[PDB]
Amino acid sequence: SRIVVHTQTLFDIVNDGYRWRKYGQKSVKGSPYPRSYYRCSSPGCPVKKHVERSSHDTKLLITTYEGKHDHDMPPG
Ligand SMILES: [Zn+2]
Numbered sequence: 821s822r823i824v825v826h827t828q829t830l831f832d833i834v835n836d837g838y839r840w841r842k843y844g845q846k847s848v849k850g851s852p853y854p855r856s857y858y859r860c861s862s863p864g865c866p867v868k869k870h871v872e873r874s875s876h877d878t879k880l881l882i883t884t885y886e887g888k889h890d891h892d893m894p895p896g
Pocket of ligand 1: 867889891
């Protein structure tokens with residue numbers, strides 16, 4: 821499934837309570853920075869997300885999630 825989250829932050833990683841493994845990057849029209857692609861780190865979990873800084877309001881990080889976690893937020 822798909823859900824978008826916006827975060828007002830000057831940093832480029834958002835702690836969303838889950839753990840992620842980056843696997844690639846693509847260029848983003850209108851932004852200095854790439855879009856980063858991640859999969860959830862939990863074994864067997866189908867969730868993926870990508871993250872890019874906004875060119876409309878550069879205070880924002882735009883995260884797009886796909887899939888539903890088959891597990892709880894990991895410990896730690
Ligand atoms: Zn997961």
